[PDB]
């Protein structure tokens, strides 16, 4: 309603490096609630990480993060912070702060959540993507249909946008979620399916945007 939480301070950081999130709280006196941070790694579940208690100001952390992080609150600024030291790629995630409801109103449930800040813990550098065509061979064909698309390899950070023919082609287009390679860079491919007949007459070009590197590529996929 008027109660609201807005975190900030997330960004890119080398491993072992350090970073401090803050959670600005409006709509209520932060000092009468209990604040928690909770994180969610890409494609993983929620993980409770730390909390602070009203009145006592007691502190509580999760095994996986105990010792390296510290939570605290500034009454004056009505804000909560999370000091994150000795970060490791392992720690990459989205970090939400959440407040505990009032005992009478919502027991110990976390009733209000932040939008979340993204904390990326990499030691890799910003790179534009390579874009290779996935040529529609006779081994990428079924019935009167043939699949094709382009591989978007080795880039960082996310995200990347992809379209086909400026965006006039959207039927049967699947663009897969990015995948963090072991090289440290990302990767993903967009594919589409189309009438085998059109292959000879119709053109197919995948437009690839990558703001983070002001890169903009347009590979023309075509039967080899």
């Amino acid at each position: 309603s008027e109660v609201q939480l807005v975190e900030s301070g997330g960004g890119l950081v080398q491993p072992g490096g350090s970073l401090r999130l803050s959670c600005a709280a409006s709509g209520f006196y932060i000092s009468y609630s209990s604040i928690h941070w909770v994180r969610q790694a890409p494609g993983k579940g929620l993980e409770w990480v730390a909390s602070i208690s009203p009145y006592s100001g007691s502190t509580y952390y999760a095994d996986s993060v105990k010792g390296r992080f510290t939570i605290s609150a500034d009454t004056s600024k009505n804000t909560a912070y999370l000091q994150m030291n000795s970060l490791r790629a392992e720690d990459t995630a989205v970090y939400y702060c959440a407040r505990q409801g009032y005992r009478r109103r919502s027991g110990r449930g976390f009733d209000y959540w932040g939008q979340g800040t993204l904390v990326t813990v990499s030691s890799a550098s910003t790179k534009g993507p390579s874009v290779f065509p996935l040529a529609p061979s006779s081994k990428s064909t079924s019935g009167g249909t043939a699949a094709l698309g382009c591989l978007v390899k080795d880039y960082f950070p996310e995200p990347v946008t992809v379209s086909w023919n400026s965006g006039a082609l959207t039927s049967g287009v699947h663009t897969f979620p990015a995948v963090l390679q072991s090289s440290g860079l990302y990767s993903l491919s967009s594919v589409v399916t189309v009438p085998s007949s059109s292959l000879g007459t119709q053109t197919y070009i995948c437009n690839v945007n990558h703001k983070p590197s002001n890169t903009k590529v347009d590979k023309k996929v075509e039967p080899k």
Binding site: A98, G107, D111, A178
Partner: protein
């Protein structure tokens, strides 16, 4: 030491109207300090149930929670389109706190076998120094599937990754891509590349493959 919350199942498919049930077992008494949350892709979780069985204010009454001993289940009388989402139980009886693994409630639809396409590395990417082989399972259901790579009939291992789409807003199907990565050296040696797909839709594993050049 630390209390565990074992949620199940991990995924679950239902139709509008269905009565859906998600269960969560605590590794030891938690009294009633359990909450349930709904979450939707890339968005803050939302409180549904608190204190084990109390419906959080604002939440639709079709949602409910109950407690038998150390077992906690969240129910939905009558599944609604907005309810397709993921759900988490959470215990707040003891520190540190813990959430269940999560339960994704997906849309049910009739089985569909995947189409299977295979793409060899482009000459371009070869000139570069590495080789990626892409295997595409397209428009299929349910989600559980199985892709194995084999070069010269050797079972590849820990040298390929895969990615999966969301249910298609159109036909509720999934599409999945598996990518195999070789050094140009490894690649240039072997001749025949293949992926084997196992899906409930196929009465026997599909093998799609090609030969270098």
């Amino acid at each position: 030491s630390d209390i565990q919350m074992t949620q199940s199942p991990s995924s679950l498919s239902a139709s509008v109207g269905d009565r859906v049930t998600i269960t969560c077992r605590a590794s030891q008494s938690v009294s009633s300090a359990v909450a349930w949350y709904q979450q939707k892709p890339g968005k803050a979780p939302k409180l549904l149930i608190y204190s084990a069985s109390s419906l959080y204010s604002g939440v639709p009454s079709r949602f409910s929670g109950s407690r038998s001993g150390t077992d906690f289940t969240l129910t939905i009388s009558s599944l609604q389109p907005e309810d397709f989402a993921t759900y988490y139980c959470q215990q707040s009886y003891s520190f540190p706190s813990t959430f269940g693994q999560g339960t994704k409630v997906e849309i049910k639809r009739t089985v569909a076998a995947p189409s299977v396409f295979i793409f060899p590395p482009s000459d371009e990417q070869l000139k570069s120094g590495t080789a990626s082989v892409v295997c595409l399972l397209n428009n299929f259901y349910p989600r559980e599937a199985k892709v194995q790579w084999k070069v010269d009939n050797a079972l590849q291992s820990g040298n390929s990754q895969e990615s999966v789409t969301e249910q298609d807003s159109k036909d509720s199907t999934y599409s999945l891509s598996s990518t195999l990565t070789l050094s140009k050296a490894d690649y240039e040696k072997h001749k025949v590349y293949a992926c084997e797909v196992t899906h409930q839709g196929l009465s026997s594993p599909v093998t799609k493959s090609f030969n270098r050049g």
